[PDB]
Amino acid sequence: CPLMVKVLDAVRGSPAINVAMHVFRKAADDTWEPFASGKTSESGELHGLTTEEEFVEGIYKVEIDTKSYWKALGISPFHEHAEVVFTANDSGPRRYTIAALLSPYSYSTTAVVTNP
Amino acid sequence: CPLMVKVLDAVRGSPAINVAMHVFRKAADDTWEPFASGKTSESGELHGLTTEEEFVEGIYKVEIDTKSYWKALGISPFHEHAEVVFTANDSGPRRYTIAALLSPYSYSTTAVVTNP
Amino acid sequence: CPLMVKVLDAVRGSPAINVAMHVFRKAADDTWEPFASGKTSESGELHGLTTEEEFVEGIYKVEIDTKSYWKALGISPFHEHAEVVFTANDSGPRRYTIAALLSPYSYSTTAVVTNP
Amino acid sequence: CPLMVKVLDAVRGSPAINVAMHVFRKAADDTWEPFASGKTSESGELHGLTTEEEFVEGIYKVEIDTKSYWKALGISPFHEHAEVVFTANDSGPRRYTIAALLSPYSYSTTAVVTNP
């Protein structure tokens, strides 16, 4: 699993379950091309987005539909979504965990980048 | 000042000075149109991006160039930028403060929304 | 004002108003002695806790009563309080802004330290 | 594992390894009694702090020695440590994950509280 996304809920203190997200890769003409997508599991994690051979260097965007998550809980949110945009670097061996911590009017995101 | 952005550096414990950002508004054809731009001051704040007359209802995107900020400090950060996307003014004019807290592999954003 | 504390509500997207906090200083016998206290204003800020003469070198603790804040809003939070413990002024007088961002099951704190 | 602590490094984008922490429980006379301790593993996690039979309702404090972590990396930190103080509640079945995200001048902590 070269890329995993984990989402947490800071209001209920729980994994954020059934959060939908799309992953895009920047194309030559500076447009965003769909790459992968899915929804978080009961653990708040989304695995199996890509494979090592497909996950080449490039600029990737993870668009997390936070608004739909809060709407389903009956809570008015600020953001339309959370976008995480990053360059994937193959100068070393690197697995990526993107974690997002969600509140209605705030979110934080961090990258845990580890070498196998 | 209906829209202000404040940027902080969590490594140095300081305002994030001279951070560029661009603000976009979603047009009727679902494209992002340029709306305003500027750089943070010595206090880490960017004021005067817009006016009450110009800041109509809509979906706005603030793209904060965090990558250039860290690179100039000698750090290779994870993110290309910090994006904040939100619907503004859809129940009337509000005042928005967007705050971003920056680390090389993490950022957080929050909104303070007040009614004049 | 060498010490200011700002508290924000990440659920409502607002300053956290009327939040009590106590400041302690570590005494020579390693006990915590009361140093100052107060409540945040309508802007979520607490100014005037101390003076430059009184704010000597030492280890300080700010204990922010986040639990009472959430309880009065009908929420049972995780934390009893948000504590910030730091050495102050040990290379000369600095100005400290402690900012706390609150959610029911999460908080973040950051410091902005400036040299007068 | 009724209680697990995970620590992440927002400067290097990695688990925070070999971070020492002590867990305390509030005693009848309002003093902090040692309860458990350990250091994070290569994954940034500390498991096996307590057992279900020993982890009774009460006020617990997790004191994470963040200062020693940053000092070992040659980075000047703001906080003496990060204290997470919370009430453990047995009104339902509850496993606790305390996660801390560390920067030199900022930290965030959240609780993921799940039912087995």
Ligand SMILES: Cc1ccc(C(=O)c2cc(O)c(O)c([N+](=O)[O-])c2)cc1
């Ligand atoms: C921005 C942010 C801050 C804190 C968290 C966070 O609390 C968290 C919790 C987990 O159970 C967990 O497995 C991870 N992880 O692997 O990165 C992070 C998640 C995101």
Ligand SMILES: Cc1ccc(C(=O)c2cc(O)c(O)c([N+](=O)[O-])c2)cc1
């Ligand atoms: C995401 C996040 C978390 C904490 C901060 C933060 O530390 C901060 C500090 C200030 O002096 C201040 O005036 C504000 N503000 O008005 O929103 C925020 C900034 C951003």
